[PDB]
Hints:
The structure is cut from a larger assembly and holds chains A (260 residues), B (143 residues), C (56 residues), D (178 residues) and E (132 residues). By secondary structure, chain A is mainly beta. Chain A has helices spanning 43-50, 57-65, 248-259; strands at 41-42, 69-71, 74-75, 82-83, 88-91, 96-99, 111-112, 121-130, 136-140, 145-147, 158-161, 168-172, 179-182, 191-198, 206-211, 216-220, 224-230, 233-234. In chain A, 11% of the residues lie in helices and 30% in strands. By secondary structure, chain B is of the alpha+beta class. Chain B has 4 helices and 6 strands, in the order αααββββββα. Chain B has helices at residues 11-21, 26-33, 35-38, 131-135, and strands spanning 47-59, 67-75, 81-85, 100-105, 121-126, 129-130. In chain B, strands 1-2-3-5-4 form a 5-stranded mixed beta barrel. In chain B, strand 5 and strand 6 (129-130) form a beta hairpin. Chain B is elongated and about 75 Å long. Helix content of chain E is 37%, strand content 27%. Chain E contains 5 helices and 4 strands, in the order E-E-H-E-E-H-H-H-H. Chain E is elongated. The N and C termini of chain E lie far apart (76 Å). Classes of the chains: A mainly beta (260), B alpha+beta (143), C mainly alpha (56), D mainly alpha (178), E alpha+beta (132). At the A-E interface, helix 2 of A face strand 1 of E. One magnesium ion (MG) binds next to loops of chain B. The PDB classes it as ribosome. Keywords: Ribosome, Candida albicans, cephaeline. The entry is titled "Structure of Candida albicans 80S ribosome in complex with cephaeline". Chain A: 40S ribosomal protein S4.
Amino acid sequence: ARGPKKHLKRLAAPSHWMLDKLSGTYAPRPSAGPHKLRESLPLVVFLRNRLKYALNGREVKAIMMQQHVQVDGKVRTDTTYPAGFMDVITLEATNEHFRLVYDVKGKFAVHRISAEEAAYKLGKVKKVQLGKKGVPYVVTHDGRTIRYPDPLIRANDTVKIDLATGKIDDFIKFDTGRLVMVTGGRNLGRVGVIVHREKHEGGFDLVHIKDALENTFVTRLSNVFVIGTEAGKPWVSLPKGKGIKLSISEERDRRRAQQG
Amino acid sequence: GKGKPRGLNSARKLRVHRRNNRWADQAYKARLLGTAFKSSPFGGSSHAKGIVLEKIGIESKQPNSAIRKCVRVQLIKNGKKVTAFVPNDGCLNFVDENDEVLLAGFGRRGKAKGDIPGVRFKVVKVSGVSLLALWKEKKEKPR
Amino acid sequence: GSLARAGKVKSQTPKVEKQEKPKKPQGRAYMRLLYTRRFVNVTLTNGKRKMNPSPA
Amino acid sequence: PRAPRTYSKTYSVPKRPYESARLDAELKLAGEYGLKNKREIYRIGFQLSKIRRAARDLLTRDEKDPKRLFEGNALIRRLVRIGVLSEDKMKLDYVLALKPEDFLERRLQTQVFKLGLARSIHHARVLITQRHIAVGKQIVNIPSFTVRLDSQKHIDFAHNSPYGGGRAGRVKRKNQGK
Amino acid sequence: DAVTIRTRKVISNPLLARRQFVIDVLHPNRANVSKDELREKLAEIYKAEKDAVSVFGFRTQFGGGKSTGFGLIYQSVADAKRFEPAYRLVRYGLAEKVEKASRQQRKQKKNRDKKIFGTQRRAQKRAARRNA
RNA sequence: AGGAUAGUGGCCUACCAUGGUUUCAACGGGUAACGGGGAAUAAGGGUUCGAUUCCGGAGAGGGAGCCUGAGAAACGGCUACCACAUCCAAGGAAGGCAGCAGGCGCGCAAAUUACCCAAUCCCGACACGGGGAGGUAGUGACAAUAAAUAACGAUACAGGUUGUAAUUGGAAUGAGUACAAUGUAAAUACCUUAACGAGGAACAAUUGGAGGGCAAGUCUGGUGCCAGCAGCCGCGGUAAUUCCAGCUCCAAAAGCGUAUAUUAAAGUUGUUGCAGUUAAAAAGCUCGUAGUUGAACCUUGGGCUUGGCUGCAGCCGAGCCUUUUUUAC
RNA sequence: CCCGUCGCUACUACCGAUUGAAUGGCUUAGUGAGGCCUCCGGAUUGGCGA
Ligand SMILES: [Mg+2]
Ligand SMILES: [Mg+2]
Ligand SMILES: [Mg+2]
Ligand SMILES: [Mg+2]
Ligand SMILES: [Mg+2]
Ligand SMILES: [Mg+2]
Ligand SMILES: [Mg+2]
Ligand SMILES: [Mg+2]
Ligand SMILES: [Mg+2]
Ligand SMILES: [Mg+2]
Ligand SMILES: [Mg+2]
Ligand SMILES: [Mg+2]
Ligand SMILES: [Mg+2]
Ligand SMILES: [Mg+2]
Ligand SMILES: [Mg+2]
Ligand SMILES: [Mg+2]
Ligand SMILES: [Mg+2]
Ligand SMILES: [Mg+2]
Ligand SMILES: [Mg+2]
Ligand SMILES: [Mg+2]
Ligand SMILES: [Mg+2]
Ligand SMILES: [Mg+2]
Ligand SMILES: [Mg+2]
Ligand SMILES: [Mg+2]
Ligand SMILES: [Mg+2]
Ligand SMILES: [Mg+2]
Ligand SMILES: [Mg+2]
Ligand SMILES: [Mg+2]
Ligand SMILES: [Mg+2]
Ligand SMILES: [Mg+2]
Ligand SMILES: [Mg+2]
Ligand SMILES: [Mg+2]
Ligand SMILES: [Mg+2]
Ligand SMILES: [Mg+2]
Ligand SMILES: [Mg+2]
Ligand SMILES: [Mg+2]
């Protein structure tokens, strides 16, 4: 109606932000950016609701206006900047590096990483095509455009971005046996290897994935993210739980043993 | 075979037959025809205010013998004239000509109650004061 | 019908004041009072139990 | 506006208002437990009716059903934890056999009277309401507080109460100070 | 009477140049402990300047004898004055309550000023010329 | 085929064909109709509701046309007409609360012309400004939660070692009031807490009833087919268990009653699941299109090996050997 | 026990001359504001243009 919306009602916010109902009428509307609104995590949510460094939105803005927060090695001062999957957030004042990777419960884990691993990131190739003057380029899942990619790189592949020069270190071809994290649907956050890709021309290709505990699930290729060349060899540190889904009874047993 | 279709593909016939036959149910018919909206003196409301035109005594029906003391009230919302019973011993003395009275039904939902013939409403308040409060001398009529 | 007799009986009923009596207990105390009065000191007349025996 | 806040009723009235058998059973049960009104009995019947409904729903499922095992064990565990269900009756078939007196046994008022801290159940209620009784190191003045098994041994007079080592109350201080 | 202060969920936050924590106060035989006295006690306990200590959001448990709130300790008074809310600095005496007209008056003045194009001096000089 | 549009398209134009929908309900009419997530009631199946905290749509008195702009056919933008309506020195000029508060009117029916950007978020050139968005308090028995109005002894009696009925005590407490601290942007309230604060503890619980349905009087006075009660059946004509009252009792209780709608009860709408000889209801009788519905029949048995799960059996899965087109579900 | 004219009282709906009356939507025809596009025009205003 006459133009873009600028507000986000609290109840209409993505559920994986884990916002409380009664704290207010509105929720942080993520800005336009590398990641989609529904699949992002604004820095205000990360710094106040997750890390609890800031006590309120005034404080998260005070933190970010002092140039502390970096996303993918670049300073961001937008409190609603849409950080997303595989993004690296650096707070060198506290000497902390985080990567936004889904945990098996469907949420963005607070996943601390070493400084050496915080120097790169992975990106799922969305499309490969030719730019002006016949220069090929790759579009990753976070909207990055890398020119002159390896001519072997195709869609659904994973590239390793140097994240300081923006170049491609090396890549992983999408194929059977590759380590995968699921980035959408009800299997979001699970980690396994590709068992069989079932093609459907004009429809949605389906990928069969086997967990490390030999559990098999099916998910859309659009929800499939290659993160490693084989089982047990991920190119990034996995969050606690290793993307292994436990039943609610198993979780209850594990909590009973963990707590006594 | 019980006189109704049983085939797996006869849902249209069953639905239409039920739809035709619910019109024989007066509650459904009155709800969809909107008779309260069109015909009811209150227009579907629970209560209605009006002005007292005259105080009238109505002879009760047999085998009872008494004078039920009612009033003729002209409703403000639509100008219709109705007869409203004034409950309790001596509350007619609380009702004067050209008073504003709030009316309500007898609880029989449009029918006359008891031996009172042709009367379907009762006085709840007069001059903005509850008739029960006036009867029990809890409050006084503003005059 | 004639309206002259409205309020006849109530008007001519001889006024009697309510006798002043101690307040009855409220709430849990009242539930306790009924409980004892009906299940502790039972006053049944050999199977004839009446809540409000008129004086006779 | 802000999201709505949930609320719900905690009781349900009988369908037939006047029934001597139910009225007598209710009055006997209220007299036994020093209850204020019939609504405190309706509340127990309501929550037992929905405990039974949940157990019945799980009991229609096959044994070894993941949902029956998970929610049945949780419901049994909760009832054993609050002492309503005995430790040797953890079968989800004895849950259906539970009765409102099992729940009224576990009220704070009943436990206060049964621990000897009060002369009668009605003394128990006024002791609780008058902030004399503490569970653990926390004062509880709600008579319907359902006492847990781990809380059973920690019911005692408040440390700052006249009956539990505190100073003398208003009346005594006014009497001995004159 | 033997006020005991416990701090839990302590987080060092150099982003806002402060340490932040939840405060548990055990105050038997005491209604509660005032914020000024808690700030003094916290200053003694952690050897920080009193003006760098901020406490707020206290509530007494049911039955008394204990209160819980939140506390901040800054590395310096300048940092506290830089990151603290104005109303808290006014609470602690580190700032003066700003004096402004009521919200109705400020809005009414804004709408009156919306009717003048150019300087007020020009507008009133022209109005004076018109009325003289 | 073109024009126009950001672009497809009878969207529009020219020419040419005569097509397109419909008893499987088109078209028209009604809606006291914005749709959905949902709500009420609910053995199951259902019936009823959804203006209204979220999502989509639409509108800004009724129409219509535009400017600017990425974005509007915008109305706290403009232009014109219609209807209302304001100031005027009579020449002219300015309007749009279905934003917040407030008023009138309408009615059975609904609150303050309060405080603030402290929180939630949004906007801007922006760490700083603004936001009746939003938050806070006020009114508020819409609904919902918890929960006081008393507790315990001794005498005296009655009573079968203890349940009370009375006149005698000393304890306990919050309703309320208040230093103070907390709360808060500042307050209010809550939570804590000095001092005060209970015998008729007047710090006094109400709303409906006592013929049946339906729990609780055949007590006393009044009236006398009157007055009145009574959802229904009925009560009242001189000992009224029913009216008006006193006493007593009953039910729910900080709530209780009344009116209206709706749901269950209703197997009195029946698919589950009604009835049709006589209670309402088999067309006077045949034909007949749509609809509904339609006999049986096409790889069965046998053999071997093996995996899993329940306590030798049983239950599922397999794999070989035996001649080995469209749907619906 | 009971039916129907007829008579009294009250209420509800119906027909009915009055080419009855009032209110709202849609529409033929006629008249037609205003914007937009287009066509010339060319107050004045820069060096042919606006
Ligand atoms: Mg809008
Ligand atoms: Mg495609
Ligand atoms: Mg069939
Ligand atoms: Mg075309
Ligand atoms: Mg064409
Ligand atoms: Mg139709
Ligand atoms: Mg409508
Ligand atoms: Mg509803
Ligand atoms: Mg709706
Ligand atoms: Mg609706
Ligand atoms: Mg709606
Ligand atoms: Mg809603
Ligand atoms: Mg909306
Ligand atoms: Mg609009
Ligand atoms: Mg408006
Ligand atoms: Mg208009
Ligand atoms: Mg607007
Ligand atoms: Mg407009
Ligand atoms: Mg407006
Ligand atoms: Mg308004
Ligand atoms: Mg309105
Ligand atoms: Mg009182
Ligand atoms: Mg009565
Ligand atoms: Mg009875
Ligand atoms: Mg008598
Ligand atoms: Mg008599
Ligand atoms: Mg009586
Ligand atoms: Mg009534
Ligand atoms: Mg029904
Ligand atoms: Mg029948
Ligand atoms: Mg017959
Ligand atoms: Mg017949
Ligand atoms: Mg026949
Ligand atoms: Mg035939
Ligand atoms: Mg067939
Ligand atoms: Mg067949």
